[PDB]
Amino acid sequence: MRILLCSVGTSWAVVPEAMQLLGSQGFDEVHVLTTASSKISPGVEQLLRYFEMHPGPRFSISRVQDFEDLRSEQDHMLFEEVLWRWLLQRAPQAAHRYICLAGGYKTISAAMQRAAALFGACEVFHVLCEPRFGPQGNREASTLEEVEQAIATNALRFVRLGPEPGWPQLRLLSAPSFPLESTLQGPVHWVRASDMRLRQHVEGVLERSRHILAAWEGISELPIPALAAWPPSHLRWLHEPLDPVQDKAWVQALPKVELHCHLGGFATHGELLHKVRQEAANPESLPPVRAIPLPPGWPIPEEPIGLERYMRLGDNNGSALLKDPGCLRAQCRLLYEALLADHVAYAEIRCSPANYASASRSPWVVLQEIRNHFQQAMEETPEDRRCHVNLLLTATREEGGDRSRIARHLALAITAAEHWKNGCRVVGVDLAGFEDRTTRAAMFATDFEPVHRVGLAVTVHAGENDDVEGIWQAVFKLSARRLGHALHLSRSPDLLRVVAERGIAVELCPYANLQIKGFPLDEEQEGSETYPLRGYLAAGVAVTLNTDNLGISQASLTDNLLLTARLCPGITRLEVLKTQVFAAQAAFANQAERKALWARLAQVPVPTDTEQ
Amino acid sequence: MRILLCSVGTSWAVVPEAMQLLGSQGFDEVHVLTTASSKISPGVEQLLRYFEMHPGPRFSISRVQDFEDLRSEQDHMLFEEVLWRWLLQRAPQAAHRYICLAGGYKTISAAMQRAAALFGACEVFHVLCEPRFGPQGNREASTLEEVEQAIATNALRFVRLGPEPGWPQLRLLSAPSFPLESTLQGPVHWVRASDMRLRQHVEGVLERSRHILAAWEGISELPIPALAAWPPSHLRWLHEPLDPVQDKAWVQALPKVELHCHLGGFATHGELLHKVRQEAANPESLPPVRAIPLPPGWPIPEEPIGLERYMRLGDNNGSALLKDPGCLRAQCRLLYEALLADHVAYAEIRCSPANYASASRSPWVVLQEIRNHFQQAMEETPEDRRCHVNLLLTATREEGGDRSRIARHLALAITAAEHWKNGCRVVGVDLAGAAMFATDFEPVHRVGLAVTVHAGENDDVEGIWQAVFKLSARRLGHALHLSRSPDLLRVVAERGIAVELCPYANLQIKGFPLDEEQEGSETYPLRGYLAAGVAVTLNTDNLGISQASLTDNLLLTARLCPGITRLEVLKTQVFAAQAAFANQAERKALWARLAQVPVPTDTE
């Protein structure tokens, strides 16, 4: 089976001439598309007559209604937009198509040759008749007799350039997808192009291909393989330094991952603290709102305020408050809205249910409510806009240490891990207060064999400190898989290798680290006191950027990603985009949750200021 | 610059008119391509006349010295070759390239257009002149005076089609790569094409670029990202089950990673055993060659012979022979050339230097020599086929309670960890075996050494638990009973711990059904581990006792695990590449070797 397709200009003999390209085998179905010019209609009748005679195969004559003649580029494109549509309907496949570019404009033959290499074809050929006919014998065949003279006298030359396989994304463009309006004005199919959709599709299938092939070299330096379809000018933008003020609208739209977030430090002051209190189940046991003054310049202080002072800023929330069932519900719902305004796709919230247990509300009752308040908010959100929330139970700070309180949280986490197997889950424990030397014994004095034997992951909170010996015991004694605020790894080069090669992730909180211990800002060169984010990446450490306390720090996740530009000199926009892939791998998520998080991470927003 | 390329034929006024595309500014140097036909010569003389009477931009006239009239596609093939090469010489840049497809045959314009669509161009226009000239005012301006009036009277209408982006890997082709010979028969540069490289290097690019696009979406499933450039038939042959008869040549040519290989069990008998004894420094001390019979069916025994009988099968080599300084070189060199013949790109050899120490050669002297016998062999191999060898020290539990050997090996590994920073390195210790939990393996962890633990012959699930969390093992050897504990099989996958599996050593020790029509209750746990997300690696263990190379071990999986595909054998190599104890420099060099996957030969 073989379709024939050719363009007809002012000479119609080409169509009967191409009929002999296969000797006497001909074509199983021929088609002719030409213009609406008044000089073409006269040739239509001749082909109709010649189609009336020798009517072996099926015939069809079509003319572009909206293309009289070539006056401007708008005309060629108009006919170009129709050729592909007509080329799909008449020719459904690419292995049966045969094309001739004899009749038509020099820009119409170019529209025929190009059109074949895009949707695939079996062959493209040309015809050239000897000018040994007509009066004086110095002209080519122009009558039904002269044409048959050259047909029977071997006066036609066929220049067959060769077949075209076609591109992969265009061999499935079916004509029904791009309908062509055909009018039956007798034996002529006058066609009209409804929309320019097909052209807007091919230009989108060949534009994306050229971008992928230009990025098939650094495809291993790209954290997200979906960045390949990005224009080369955009990929050069991605490789330049981050701008904290120009990229705010790009970082704010990134699908991010949260791994370090305390539930009790969320709404500590401002319009949010007063909103949590208004939800109290009994607005009579709420303690008086203290007056905790934020240090000057908050969120960016003038000097570090130490860890002890940093905790005290969250005294209007936490253990006091949220013991009320109504105020706890508000926190678990006002916090999920924050994770939706940051475009966070996966979050692990750190909670201490034993801090919220009253005489009638056991730690399990509190933990069961926290899980169900996030699971309801998760279910009331579209699957494409839904932030997945998992829970970590915290072995708290110096408030802990007692044997009768660090093993109650471990038992609570073990029971919860086996309880919920879908939706919001308890995925691990957070050994906070690990930097407390007194509580250090309590952490190593308690057995963690049950925690590891049930599949719960351990993350260690290496807060403000300089004891590199604690990090060694966290990796090898507690089998921790993540490290919190490990800001002095570069000092011990031998420990930086162990962390990098073993795959332990490091949780860095830009704002919390700046407000507690302080770091140089905007320095033109990397010195000795500089933030270690860029040194960890060079050493092969899987670093992640988190918020820690959305309320105490007064900075969102976007404000933490932007501060790295002013905190690490030279950090690029592919570096921040790379920490989101490290976080996705450091998350204590199962296969189902990971597969849903990579889909969200593979939707990096396109930049807008890629013009210089 | 605004270089312009013009094609000419029986009409020559196109070039003088095409030069007006830019208006009064014009071009800086317009170039013309022409054939060898005599009929075009009158235009050529007129074209030179126009150029000489219109001085300015560099004017060049080139004729196709091997094409005179369109007769067959052979002429067409020769036209494009020169055309592309001609366009690669007269117009180097893609922003200075202005092309006019008017002049020439009907197939010439397509080549002038298609070629632009492949190499790009600033513009490929089309100048049309009003037929208001000639003696009767009916023909297009043909003479010198008519062309001027056509330009002067604005009888020109240029049909601009647009610029051309081209293709990324094709928008770099320079002139010297595909040169040309221009015979100066006067002001005309008669050009000709020597070879056809500019049509085989181009036609093949679009072949590879369509494979990438087709297989790009189906990516992230290929362990090696470079496989996307494979033909779809090849990329679909990769997803079919392995066939350990027809694939003995593709598996043999694969770059492989060796993570479990014992030095002392290499040349245990046969021709290799005598080539190690033959090089002994003190032939008067070589022990007599004990008679050790191999169970019938070796390497495939009719029944599992257990571990105790397996060890005794290699009693003609090892500490018996390796205490000789000369026999320790043949072992280290006859072993490195066995990995070269197997295409191994990175290997970790397990040795016990304390078993070869005499009263004059301390364990450090033996290790000092083993390291330099591998480093010397590595440096004497080209850096293209060079297998990088690292060393693990095996601290085997002894059946005397004698833990002095354990102490010497652990101290030796810590000492050698800092000594060597390049070339062959001691990268970890092998805990081939409660005492180790009282051994205080912390010091090896503090110096950066990795730990590998052989899983005992018993189904000691509590043993694999303590290796992961007490010994902090990063790899597990012979952990065939992981599926027993569903919670353990999930901890191993989530922590990224790798499992070292030896298809022959496991078959000849425990025994597994072979070529069973479907998965059963006593099948090799390869596919079960892979499905559970466990990082699995296939090794040789003892290349001498087992009598099988790394290639044979990979093929035996086609029988132990029915339905295993050829993409899985590549996954095990990527898992090994990430489970290796190599550093960044070594890992970077190993990824380059892995990326050179051999291409399937049948595919049909």
Ligand SMILES: Nc1ncnc2c1ncn2[C@@H]1O[C@H](COP(=O)(O)OP(=O)(O)OP(=O)(O)O)[C@@H](O)[C@H]1O
């Ligand atoms: N620095 C921190 N370390 C650990 N958990 C913290 C920290 N700050 C806040 N939290 C979170 O707060 C919750 C319990 O602590 P909470 O905020 O109630 O503090 P507290 O010590 O009980 O008293 P206060 O009311 O003065 O804050 C848990 O979610 C815990 O994760």
Ligand SMILES: Nc1ncnc2c1ncn2[C@@H]1O[C@H](COP(=O)(O)OP(=O)(O)OP(=O)(O)O)[C@@H](O)[C@H]1O
């Ligand atoms: N498949 C196996 N399973 C367990 N242990 C093994 C296996 N293969 C070898 N071993 C033991 O592991 C250690 C590896 O050391 P190696 O084989 O290089 O030494 P050797 O020179 O053969 O020692 P020997 O003096 O015992 O003969 C030895 O104890 C060897 O017996």
Ligand SMILES: [Mg+2]
């Ligand atoms: Mg031995």
Ligand SMILES: [Zn+2]
């Ligand atoms: Zn914290």
Ligand SMILES: [Zn+2]
């Ligand atoms: Zn072993």
